[PDB]
């Protein structure tokens, strides 16, 4: 989604469902490659080491001054008729330049966006319909014309655009954590190894303080850590090679 071959429209975004895996979010925040990285309700460095039920990456393109519309507590045509986020949206919105990426000879006028809809979209509701609606009580009955506006507007894409008119490849990471199992998490830091010394440890399954040693003790590969007769910390399996 961050290096997608083609980015879709603001109303027909490509939603990538992330589940049952790990992924670092601070690696991209401190990458110095993307322009904008703003999270609402939680810092991007805090959620890097926190699990979530599901994470959706909505890939689409909007202008520089249009990024303010895609946020909790903000209105707009793209925020009400194309992609409505909830007022309590606790996700993130990452964006970066796209002039040298999605542009072509003569300009890329393939992107589109809806100006109006019969009703406002609900939170996280996609709509790819091109139905021509009527302005007043006199409907045109189908084709465009006589106060029957076409819902989608052409998207200007030129290399000499301004900072507010520049399109940005936006990737909205909608985070959600409920009572269901937390299937999405992030990776941990590097590892160390010191033996024959009382030191603190935090393995994949448990933590504490003890002395690391080696012996000929066996261990079942389908388990993580062992316990003694009195349920005390005993020999454990290395999270690394067996």
């Amino acid at each position: 989604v961050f290096n997608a071959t083609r980015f879709a429209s603001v109303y027909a975004w490509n939603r990538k469902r992330i589940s049952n895996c790990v992924a670092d979010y601070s690696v991209l925040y401190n990458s110095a490659s993307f322009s904008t990285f703003k999270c609402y309700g939680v810092s991007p460095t805090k959620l890097n080491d926190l699990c979530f039920t599901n994470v959706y990456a909505d890939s689409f393109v909007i202008r520089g001054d249009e990024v303010r519309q895609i946020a909790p507590g903000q209105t707009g045509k793209i925020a009400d008729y194309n992609y409505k986020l909830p007022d309590d949206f606790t996700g993130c919105v990452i964006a970066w330049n796209s002039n040298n990426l999605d542009s072509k000879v003569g300009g890329n006028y393939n992107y589109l966006y809806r100006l109006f809809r019969k009703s406002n979209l609900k939170p996280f509701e996609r709509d790819i319909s091109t139905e021509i609606y009527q302005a007043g009580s006199t409907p045109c009955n189908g084709v465009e014309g006589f106060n029957c506006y076409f819902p989608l507007q052409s998207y200007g894409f030129q290399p000499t655009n301004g900072v507010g008119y520049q399109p940005y490849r936006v990737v909205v990471l909608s985070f959600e954590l409920l009572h269901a199992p937390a299937t999405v998490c992030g990776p941990k830091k590097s590892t160390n190894l010191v033996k024959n010394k009382c030191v603190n440890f935090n393995f994949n399954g448990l933590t504490g303080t003890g002395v690391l040693t080696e012996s000929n003790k066996k261990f079942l590969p389908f388990q993580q850590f062992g316990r003694d007769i009195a349920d005390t910390t005993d020999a454990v399996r290395d999270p690394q090679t067996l």
Partner: antibody
Framework: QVQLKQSGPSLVQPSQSLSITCTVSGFSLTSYGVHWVRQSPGKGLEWLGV???????DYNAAFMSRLSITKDNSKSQVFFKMNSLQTDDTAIYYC???????????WGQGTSVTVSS | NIVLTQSPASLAVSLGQRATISCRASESVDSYGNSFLHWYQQKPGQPPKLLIY???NLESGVPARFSGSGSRTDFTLTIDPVEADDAATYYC?????????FGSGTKLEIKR
């Protein structure tokens, strides 16, 4: 890339009729309705009419009884039927690509129509 | 009969100031969620071109100096800062009611 130039007329006489064909390039004719305007007869721009997406036509209060638009979907060409042209109707006719709210995003070169024998 | 009484006929504004081109209308408003007009710009040696649609949206290729707003009857085009390459005739287009007439056209001139 986008071309909306006009051609077709040979001699436009007063109190006569003649058709103008505007080229359609850069987009499908069945997707956008070609708009029509003239080149500032006195005051600023003036509206002539607009063709639907394969339906009907709308015209201005002054040009509804004199001008008519005809959409040829078999030839992919937009025809403009003129009727009862006067000496004051001399102006350059322009075509344009339909926007969202009946806007004119793109413009062509058009053709210079002069009403005189 | 929709006659957009676009006023004034011309403007004498110096560089760096704010030019105000008004556009009055009579019919009509509440088409969908707004009632704004489309603004254009025609140079003495070039056909017209669309700058801002509905007076409140963004458009690429044109400079950022073009902005505007409008009430239910009077619509305003805002050019700020006025540079040395924006001397041309500007128009407004009716789109919320048939006929889709245009204004008389204001000649924005640089006050040298």
């Amino acid at each position: 890339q986008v071309q909306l130039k006009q051609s077709g007329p040979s001699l436009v006489q007063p109190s006569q009729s003649l058709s103008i064909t505007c080229t359609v390039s850069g987009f499908s004719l069945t997707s956008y309705g070609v708009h029509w305007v003239r080149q500032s007869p006195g005051k600023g721009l003036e509206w002539l009419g607009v063709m639907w997406r394969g339906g009907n036509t709308d015209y201005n209060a002054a040009f509804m009884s004199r001008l008519s638009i005809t959409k040829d979907n078999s030839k992919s060409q937009v025809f403009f039927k003129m009727n009862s042209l006067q000496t004051d109707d001399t102006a350059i006719y322009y075509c344009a690509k339909n926007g969202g709210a009946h806007a004119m995003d793109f413009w062509g070169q058009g053709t210079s129509v002069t009403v005189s024998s | 009969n929709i006659v957009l009484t676009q006023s004034p006929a011309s403007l004498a504004v110096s560089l760096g100031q704010r030019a105000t081109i008004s556009c009055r209308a009579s019919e009509s408003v509440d088409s969908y969620g707004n009632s704004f007009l489309h603004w254009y710009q025609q140079k003495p040696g070039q056909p017209p071109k669309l700058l801002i649609y509905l007076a409140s949206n963004l458009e690429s290729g044109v400079p950022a100096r073009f902005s505007g707003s409008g009430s239910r009857t009077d619509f305003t085009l805002t050019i700020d800062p006025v540079e040395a390459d924006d001397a041309a005739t500007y128009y407004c287009q009716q789109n919320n009611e048939d006929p889709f007439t245009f204004g008389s056209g204001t000649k924005l001139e640089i006050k040298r």
